[PDB]
Design a protein around this ligand. Structure first.
Ligand SMILES: CCNC(=O)CSc1nnc(C(C)C)o1
Ligand SMILES: [Mn+2]
Ligand SMILES: [Mn+2]
Lengths: 137, 137
């Protein structure tokens, strides 16, 4: 039986700028780094950054919709998003199709998101404003 | 302040086989489905499958090391790996690290892993046998 996400591993092209992005800019906790990677946590999430010569800096129009959303409180959401904007962090999406979200890119173009709300809250919102053809189980 | 992973969204080329893989083969709970996606849970993980015509069925040699690991107990690991093997699910890597790991591909080539063990367990092993250049914080 699978019980959740054990870890998220992101391939990165340049380790130090990626560590700085996740630790300094996003505020995650850095636990260890080595010549080819780093381990961070964000709450319960174990994030691994893995130096990969295959990773390319990818513009958002070249990648699919696969993305990683991080939880933030309603009280903190807007000022965190505005700080990322003021820091020049690139974006990839503007239309809020899944609630209160801010869509931004990491240095390699990994698609990230700040989101306010749980799955239960999103299901409740969708009952009122459902996506086309939506069925609830 | 970011408090954890809010959700993981995977772009999928065909919704029905992806729902079958995550719900039926991998045992995740299907909460909702609409014409262009689905919401599932796996423990605390909120997973979204998003139908995306830009998703390519991608051979593992053509994607980088970015991957998504799910937690499973040691006791359940071998029978779950055998289930994936019976279903013909391809493996993209052999395990050479601490903690059991099974590295397998989803229908679109998303790189997945079953892993036994926490960040704390990994850090303890690393303290005893540090990787090249390893620093702790
Ligand atoms: C399947 C259950 N997992 C999730 O809903 C992850 S997002 C999530 N979980 N708690 C929260 C807070 C905003 C209350 O947000
Ligand atoms: Mn999202
Ligand atoms: Mn892994």
């Amino acid at each position: 039986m699978l019980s959740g996400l054990n870890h998220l591993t992101l391939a990165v092209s340049q380790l130090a700028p990626s560590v700085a992005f996740y630790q300094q800019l996003l505020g995650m906790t850095l636990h260890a780094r080595w010549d080819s990677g780093a381990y961070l946590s964000c709450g319960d999430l174990w994030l691994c950054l893995s130096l990969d010569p295959q990773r390319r800096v990818t513009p958002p129009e070249e990648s699919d919709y696969t993305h990683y959303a991080f939880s933030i409180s309603e009280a903190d959401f807007a000022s965190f998003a505005a700080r990322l904007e003021a820091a020049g962090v690139a974006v990839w999406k503007l239309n809020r199709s899944e609630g209160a979200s801010h869509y931004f890119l990491d240095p390699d173009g990994h698609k990230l998101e700040l989101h306010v709300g749980s799955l239960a809250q999103r299901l409740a919102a969708c009952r009122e404003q459902p996506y086309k053809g939506m069925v609830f189980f």
